[PDB]
Amino acid sequence: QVWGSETVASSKVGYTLPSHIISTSDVTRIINSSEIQSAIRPAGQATQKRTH
Amino acid sequence: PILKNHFRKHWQERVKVHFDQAGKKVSRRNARATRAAKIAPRPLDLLRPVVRAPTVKYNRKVRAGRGFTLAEVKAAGLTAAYARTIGIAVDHRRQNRNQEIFDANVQRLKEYQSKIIVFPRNGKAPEAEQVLSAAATFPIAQPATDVEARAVQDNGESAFRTLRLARSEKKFRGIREKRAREKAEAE
Amino acid sequence: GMRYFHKQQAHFWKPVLNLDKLWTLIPEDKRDQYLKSASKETAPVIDTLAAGYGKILGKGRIPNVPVIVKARFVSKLAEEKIRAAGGVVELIA
Amino acid sequence: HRTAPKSDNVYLKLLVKLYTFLARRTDAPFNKVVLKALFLSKINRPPVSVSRIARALKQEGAANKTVVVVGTVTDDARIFEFPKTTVAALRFTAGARAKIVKAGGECITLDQLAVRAPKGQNTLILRGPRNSRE
Amino acid sequence: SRPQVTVHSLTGEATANALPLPAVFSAPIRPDIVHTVFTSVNKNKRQAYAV
RNA sequence: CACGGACCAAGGAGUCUAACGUCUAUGCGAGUGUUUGGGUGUAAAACCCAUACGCGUAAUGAAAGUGAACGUAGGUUGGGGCCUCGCAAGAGGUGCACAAUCGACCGAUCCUGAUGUCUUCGGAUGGAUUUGAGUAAGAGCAUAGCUGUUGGGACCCGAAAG
RNA sequence: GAAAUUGUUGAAAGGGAAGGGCAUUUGAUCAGACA
RNA sequence: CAACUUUGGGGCCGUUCCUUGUCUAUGUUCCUUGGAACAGGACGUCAUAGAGGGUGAGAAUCCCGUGUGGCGAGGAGUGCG
């Protein structure tokens, strides 16, 4: 009641709780989605073999 | 940029910082409480009248004025000397040239007279709780100048042209009357 | 030009409200039903003075739905757009 | 030339991390454009009025594109009829979001856009009007 | 829906009563905003000093 | 050259403030700003709030004043992205910001002088240049930070004083 | 109970400066590690 | 010319204010160290009192206090019961 919700407005006049700018906090779950994993190119590889 | 800085006039001798703002607020609340104790059943304030603000900028607003006029008090059914002792503010220098404001104030005084108990002077007074504020009890109400929705009464004449004819007749009244006087003396 | 002795900013107060922002003046809850009804009887009444404006201006386009617009002043083209929408301007006394 | 934003916002850093991955490993220029746009300072991310979104969606063949605004989407009471579409934005004002939903649309974040449109397919990046001062 | 929060009695046992999580607990957790607002608000009880 | 330096301790010089800016972060966003004040309080904190007011959303003219849509809010050129075909190369379409030019709109300037009219009032209609941080689907308000200017003792000490 | 400055003790250097850089002699001193 | 309505002064006791006085929880239990326990450990108690100060080193529980309530004393007062 004090801070409002998506159902009750608020006791603070004209207050709405802040809105997220990113839907989920976990970015690794986003990157490992089926759609991201489809879109991207093959992985590459992190530590490089020294040539010459 | 062009910017003025008035800080050469030995200003350091007169810098006032309001470190007392919280202390002054507490002292003010204490004073209100103790005055309410002193006047124990009476409210803290006096019944203020309903007033239309002065200028073109503010005449659209209605404001709590200083005190009810003598006409308002007599039309409410009481004398100004008695009104001042039942917490009603009386202003001797305010004039009445507006029936709406006059009737609004008389209605305020009628409501005020009925919403209060006045204890008998002799003694054995009835118990009454102190209501601290009379402006919160009888708030100033903005008159409604029109209903929410109406019919479209189109006269046909333009509004802008009405304003321009008004400005024109304001402009040329004097010379028009001068010409009228000349034609009059020429019969 | 001139030099204006003893300026009082009370009598030269005159805020401007263009036509595009006019319908904001109607409360947001009743606005959509006023748009949907669109009737010459029970057309909405806008007192701009009570809202705090002095002159109505003709910038935007207003929906072709009548509205009774009360103001101290209106521009010629603001008059034309209000009337052409089925509404009217009533000068506020 | 520019790799990290000056904002300390945790979630903005997460968005930058996400689109850094996408712009590294997708070769679609949309993700590169968006990542470049995420680092912009606030004067260089002007708000995009919701009526500007409607005007962009009124173009030829652009009626069903998912608009992306890398910045703030703002209300505009100067518009009365608003089309139902999907809008991806960094931030929505309450009025803008309320208007987009009232028309039947949807206000999605940029990572929800990344899930739906990972290579930025069928999108329409709008940049707000820029000139603020000299 | 909103996950329930169990309510403990004065002896620490969890009663059957449980409550929906209020919507403020889904608010964004912004350490930077908390930091700057704290570091400004934490100055508001100070008293003046001077020579 | 000239000036400072026998030695050691401690002190010792770009500070604070106000008004404007630039940039950046943050909040909200055609709005914004609780903290003059009121309510409340675990009491200079924190929490909450009505009316007003400031700035912004409208400009222009010496002023009276007047006041921003012919059009899909504009035509062409360019333009990040996206869309269509294409293994690709490219081909087309759409084109945000922005930029160039040509038009439109508002005010100012010079004309023309309709519908009518207290016969002098009104300004309809249509042109001519220039013109403005002007409109042409708003971008601001507030706070903070690094800071620039200016005024205060103003980086510190010291000049001939009235 | 600092430094300037001083006394005594021990070591050392000194043919009209003292100090400082690189390197090493010499004397004095001193840390670390278990297939 | 015409009818109605209103009213002082004190004394006594309380209340209010002020200024004062007094009263109002709980370990100085065991072990080690130390010149000193106010330190470390063990077991407790009070808490509307864990603000502060003293006491032979960091003490809620040793002392004064603090917190909360009670009882008074002298006044001012006509504010009012």
Side-chain angles (χ1 to χ4, degrees), chain B residues 68-78 91 94 96 102 106 109:
Chain B
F68 295 86
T69 62
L70 277 296
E72 282 146 349
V73 180
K74 300 294 187 291
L78 73 170
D91 189 2
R94 194 167 77 82
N96 273 116
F102 172 81
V106 167
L109 289 171

Side-chain angles (χ1 to χ4, degrees), chain C residues 22-65:
Chain C
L22 182 63
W23 277 80
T24 71
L25 278 297
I26 288 171
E28 190 265 328
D29 65 66
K30 281 198 158 28
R31 197 175 308 138
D32 70 343
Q33 65 183 177
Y34 274 119
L35 276 296
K36 185 177 77 175
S37 289
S39 58
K40 194 174 181 182
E41 190 276 331
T42 180
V45 174
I46 306 188
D47 171 330
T48 67
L49 210 51
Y53 303 107
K55 187 164 194 176
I56 296 310
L57 295 189
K59 171 75 147 302
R61 292 180 181 177
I62 62 170
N64 205 336
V65 291

Side-chain angles (χ1 to χ4, degrees), chain B residues 56-95:
Chain B
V56 286
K57 193 193 198 151
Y58 291 109
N59 56 353
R60 62 195 174 94
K61 297 296 289 183
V62 166
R63 179 181 56 77
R66 191 211 163 75
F68 295 86
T69 62
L70 277 296
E72 282 146 349
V73 180
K74 300 294 187 291
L78 73 170
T79 62
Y82 175 82
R84 283 189 166 119
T85 65
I86 54 162
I88 286 184
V90 187
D91 189 2
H92 76 256
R93 59 184 100 83
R94 194 167 77 82
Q95 64 183 357

Side-chain angles (χ1 to χ4, degrees), chain A residues 21-23 35 40-43, chain D residues 21 25 90 109 111-112 114-115:
Chain A
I21 66 169
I22 194 173
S23 53
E35 281 282 71
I40 54 176
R41 67 178 168 73
Chain D
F21 171 82
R25 293 166 42 70
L90 207 68
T109 77
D111 49 311
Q112 300 186 327
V115 180

Side-chain angles (χ1 to χ4, degrees), chain C residues 1 5 9-13 15 20-21 23 25 28 40 43 49 52 56 59 65-66 73 76 83-84 91:
Chain C
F5 284 177
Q9 308 93 349
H11 49 67
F12 287 152
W13 169 87
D20 51 1
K21 298 293 183 182
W23 277 80
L25 278 297
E28 190 265 328
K40 194 174 181 182
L49 210 51
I56 296 310
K59 171 75 147 302
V65 291
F73 304 92
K76 187 176 183 178
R83 259 173 80 193
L91 277 297

Side-chain angles (χ1 to χ4, degrees), chain D residues 19-37:
Chain D
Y19 277 98
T20 301
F21 171 82
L22 279 184
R24 178 172 80 229
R25 293 166 42 70
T26 44
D27 291 329
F30 170 95
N31 297 341
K32 294 167 168 61
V33 164
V34 167
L35 187 73
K36 180 67 173 66

